[PDB]
Design brief:
The structure is a homodimer.
Chain A (H helix, E strand, L loop, with lengths): L9 H20 L11 E5 L5 H14 L17 H12 L9 H19 L7 E2 L26 E3 L6 E3 L7 E3 L5 E4 L8 E2 L6 E2 L5 E2 L10 E2 L6 H7 L2 H9 L4 H9 L8 H8 L18 H17 L2 H4 L23 E2 L9 E2 L13 E3 L1
Bound molecules: a molecule of 3 linked components (NAG-NAG-BMA) (2 copies), 2-acetamido-2-deoxy-beta-D-glucopyranose (NAG) (6 copies), alpha-D-mannopyranose (2 copies) and copper (II) ion (CU) (4 copies).
PDB class: oxidoreductase
Keywords: catechol oxidase, type-3 copper center, binuclear copper enzyme, glycosylated, oxidoreductase
Assembly: dimeric
Amino acid sequence: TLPTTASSSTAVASSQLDQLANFAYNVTTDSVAGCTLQNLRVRRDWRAFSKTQKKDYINSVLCLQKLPSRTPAHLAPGARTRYDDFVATHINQTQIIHYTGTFLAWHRYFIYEFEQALRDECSYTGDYPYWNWGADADNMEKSQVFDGSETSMSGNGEYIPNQGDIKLLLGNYPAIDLPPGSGGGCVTSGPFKDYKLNLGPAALSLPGGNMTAAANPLTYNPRCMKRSLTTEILQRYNTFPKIVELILDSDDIWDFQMTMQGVPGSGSIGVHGGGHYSMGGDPGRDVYVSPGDTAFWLHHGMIDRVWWIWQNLDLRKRQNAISGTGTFMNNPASPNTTLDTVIDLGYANGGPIAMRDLMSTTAGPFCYVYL
Amino acid sequence: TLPTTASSSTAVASSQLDQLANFAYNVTTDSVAGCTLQNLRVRRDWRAFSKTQKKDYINSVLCLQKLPSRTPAHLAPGARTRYDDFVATHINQTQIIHYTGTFLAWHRYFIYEFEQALRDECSYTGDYPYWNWGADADNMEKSQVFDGSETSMSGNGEYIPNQGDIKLLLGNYPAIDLPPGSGGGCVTSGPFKDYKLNLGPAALSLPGGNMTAAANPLTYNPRCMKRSLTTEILQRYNTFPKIVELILDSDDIWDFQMTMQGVPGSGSIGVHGGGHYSMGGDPGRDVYVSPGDTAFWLHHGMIDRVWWIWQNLDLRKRQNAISGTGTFMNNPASPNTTLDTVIDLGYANGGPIAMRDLMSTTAGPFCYVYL
Ligand SMILES: *[C@@H]1O[C@H](CO)[C@@H](O[C@@H]2O[C@H](CO)[C@@H](O[C@@H]3O[C@H](CO)[C@@H](O)[C@H](O)[C@@H]3O)[C@H](O)[C@H]2NC(C)=O)[C@H](O)[C@H]1NC(C)=O
Ligand SMILES: *[C@@H]1O[C@H](CO)[C@@H](O[C@@H]2O[C@H](CO)[C@@H](O[C@@H]3O[C@H](CO)[C@@H](O)[C@H](O)[C@@H]3O)[C@H](O)[C@H]2NC(C)=O)[C@H](O)[C@H]1NC(C)=O
Ligand SMILES: *[C@@H]1O[C@H](CO)[C@@H](O)[C@H](O)[C@H]1NC(C)=O
Ligand SMILES: *[C@@H]1O[C@H](CO)[C@@H](O)[C@H](O)[C@H]1NC(C)=O
Ligand SMILES: *[C@@H]1O[C@H](CO)[C@@H](O)[C@H](O)[C@H]1NC(C)=O
Ligand SMILES: *[C@@H]1O[C@H](CO)[C@@H](O)[C@H](O)[C@H]1NC(C)=O
Ligand SMILES: *[C@@H]1O[C@H](CO)[C@@H](O)[C@H](O)[C@H]1NC(C)=O
Ligand SMILES: *[C@@H]1O[C@H](CO)[C@@H](O)[C@H](O)[C@H]1NC(C)=O
Ligand SMILES: *[C@H]1O[C@H](CO)[C@@H](O)[C@H](O)[C@@H]1O
Ligand SMILES: *[C@H]1O[C@H](CO)[C@@H](O)[C@H](O)[C@@H]1O
Ligand SMILES: [Cu+2]
Ligand SMILES: [Cu+2]
Ligand SMILES: [Cu+2]
Ligand SMILES: [Cu+2]
């Protein structure tokens, strides 16, 4: 049988998670015959990628970072690459894709279409990778995603000493304080050391409490990607126990999505805010520009995975479950999201698509499972 | 001497307000010499306009509702008139002009530039009118702004019986419930009965709790202006006592602007939400499209007046006082508004202008006082 209450023990909570995942795997695989068992893709933990498989993915990303942008220049003047096309649409729609009813599904579609670009333009034929926070929550620096080696998404940034805390303001609420991490500057190694971040900053939190906001975040501001790896953040918000609490203690989609994102006032930023902010730097600390950090795709692989596990714990009730509205924290108010709500990624990839077609990983345009 | 504590008595609170206003008038007039006593314009209560003066203003508005729109068609396809130019920019910027640091100053500049259009394109040579809520708080229908006569901003809409309540959601907070008023449909008389509302709805609250949101609120949706005059709303939020509480019990700009707008969770929508929602209808109940209702300009004349009174109670401390950020309720987070923050009305009128130049009615582009 499955666990119903999350343990505080790291070792078991991991295996607790593993059981819940296998269950989710079972329901998904044996429910599939569009999507069939034959063309069912499997998304996999980055650790499970052999060296060359890691590099294949990385090279496909680098490829999208070389191919020219399709976005009409006058709409995103700072866009240069196909990768920017994805970053631009995210910055463009930030206000309607976080703390909305569409949060989970939009991101699921976002990473899927990113994947399609890798496959259709950059010859990627491997599996979509995800970053399992829990395994790295004691040492982010040793994460295979962030260790600075040739198979990381680059690693830490130039150490900058004595930086002030990050002070996160969700609305008018009291700030959540976070340490500045052990980096600060440009990433010093790894495949993306010469990657040029072109857009933003739109809302970049700085050590000290400041925030940098370009006049127009879609205009040209070429600079390095910065990181400040911050283990304390992961161990505060992204441990296996926190992951399993999120899954086991959320009886509806509202509680799920809110707990995952961090409910304002609780002093908590969830596994989702945890994973983003643990990267530090730029656009690591910019809610709008975050896809500009290459780790984003793996992070959201894991977000999608966690959502998919949760859905399968109760597929009758949860598969199509939606809650929230079309505006960030419903500010200003907007209508409830419904199964007919249409989302899109502008010029990044794919076309407009209704929520109903996004709710399942093995329906609509989707045919994948997480291992 | 001035009152420091608001009375609960309507008669005195009115005169309490009158004293505070004369004081504000005194400080403003005798501080002026750009702006001098010579070219100092006076803005006046609508009741103080003689019949022909009322009509002159109305005709100038009707004029802007006939002259063709300047907004690049591809940016606001639904725009037809110079009046739409103003409505379009408001819908366009709603998310950064309410519950922001720029709320008060942006609107002050917005109505000033509207006034400039009336004068420069529609030969208006009279005074800017404002709507004093307090005097009408017992019978909105008898308001000279809304009595349906030829000198109103049109009046009530076709009565629609048995409409459900309005259910206002500020974020995730519990709904504030309001009665549906005594209208519902198209305005039945007055100068604007054949006025065609072209934009929205963007976020239109409906009796019953529903909300109508066009896919693109800047596209073409020509329809009548609707109203449902609702006295109970004015007497709940816009009485002379409520006005004087707002002015006397707000010791800083944050408290002022928040109390005026209604702080979320308090079950109160302030004199500002009160004045808007008392109109009912469409775009009366649409925070984005509200300038589409012609009364908007008078309402915000009074908003500006109330702010101006408050500033002059303590001109040393309050004249340049700013608080808040660049995003609706700071969702998502943005940097603090500062005196260097630039605002603009797109294609409506005027150019970009910094907050510092908006803080005083007798500095920057401004040279007016309220009587
Ligand atoms: C609503 O607000 C947005 C944001 O301010 C406005 O977007 C702005 O649109 C204008 C016109 O497209 C852009 O100006 C520039 O015009 C020149 C032509 O002279 C063109 O070559 C440029 O590439 C660009 O189009 C401006 O970049 C853009 N601003 C931002 C920050 O995106 C929009 O106009 C507003 N909508 C309405 C109806 O006013
Ligand atoms: C960010 O989001 C906004 C809102 O979706 C996007 O605005 C959209 O811009 C496109 C392109 O200008 C508009 O499409 C239309 O294109 C035809 C040409 O085929 C033109 O004739 C039309 O007048 C119009 O320009 C579309 O109306 C507009 N959508 C809305 C709701 O405003 C914007 O493209 C996004 N920015 C980025 C970088 O993706
Ligand atoms: C998944 O299915 C397999 C194969 O039938 C079964 O052995 C295993 O116990 C299942 N796991 C869970 C958690 O249900
Ligand atoms: C922004 O303003 C608030 C109060 O108005 C202040 O407490 C806060 O520290 C400011 N933030 C920064 C980084 O200036
Ligand atoms: C943050 O903003 C404050 C206020 O302008 C400024 O004094 C300080 O230099 C800034 N800190 C840094 C170094 O980013
Ligand atoms: C305004 O100034 C006039 C003229 O000096 C004075 O008579 C009046 O008392 C003043 N009103 C207030 C409230 O200060
Ligand atoms: C929107 O959804 C919430 C709960 O998800 C519900 O309570 C509310 O009544 C809905 N509003 C409308 C008008 O459908
Ligand atoms: C409001 O929305 C609900 C849910 O779709 C619908 O059943 C009802 O007809 C709507 N009410 C009206 C008449 O606007
Ligand atoms: C197991 O290790 C985790 C970190 O991965 C801790 O959070 C937990 O308390 C236990 O020590
Ligand atoms: C004076 O009248 C006002 C309405 O204008 C009331 O709110 C007040 O209680 C007093 O009766
Ligand atoms: Cu996102
Ligand atoms: Cu994210
Ligand atoms: Cu407004
Ligand atoms: Cu208003």
